[PDB]
């Protein structure tokens, strides 16, 4: 299991060059994002791109030849997670399975947020599907990526995890989205991330029935680099080094970030809002990737 795997939005043009980043930084593990529904119970990249056509997923074989790998992520902030377009857990497991089988995946991620997260009926249907997927694909590593506050997982995240456990899902990591807290949270975003991770560990220790040590290994942290969607909140490179320090002292499962494409300076320099293709702060290219690479 790799300790740092940044998210790569495959919908962005030009297609992110996974191998070029691996050559420049040594980071060769990525969370490819996102598989959603285009209106049917059928997986598509960004809700529109066929599995055989995605130009970032097409790189998986070459990345594996350099010894890297990918975790594919379902859901995300944009678009519609497949549980909302699949009426049964068997159809839903089949949809997820086409992805696992297409790319010979051994790691998957379910990024459940927005309208999907409080849909309790869909969550159970997903948990049933994932338990079935974990039965037909033994060892398939499953992570849930969930919104987080400095005080920990929200109640709908806690409830999603309890539903996953009673439905027989083996949750290998709970990856918190340590970002976008709100206007009442204007303090340092590295300290917030540490605070959120500390609370999350206590919560999943109980919900997932793990030892203290096992619960730390089950924590994963994903900040939004640079200016956040909540524009007043900035996760700086200094914040990344604080998160790396904390991840080392606790043995956190892995770090990630939103996102690899944003890990460069905008053409205008520093800007006061978030952008899908740059960080909105001053930096050298791949600054955050090099910073988080210290956790390997």
TrEMBL record:
GO terms for biological process: chitin catabolic process; polysaccharide catabolic process. Disulfide bonds join 41-86, 266-278. Keywords: Carbohydrate metabolism, Chitin degradation, Chitin-binding, Glycosidase, Hydrolase, Polysaccharide degradation, Signal. It is an enzyme of class 3 (hydrolase). Its EC number is 3.2.1.14. It catalyses: Random endo-hydrolysis of N-acetyl-beta-D-glucosaminide (1->4)-beta-linkages in chitin and chitodextrins. GO terms for molecular function: chitin binding; endochitinase activity; polysaccharide binding. Residues 1-296 form the GH18 domain. This is chitinase. It comes from Streptomyces venezuelae (strain ATCC 10712 / CBS 650.69 / DSM 40230 / JCM 4526 / NBRC 13096 / PD 04745).
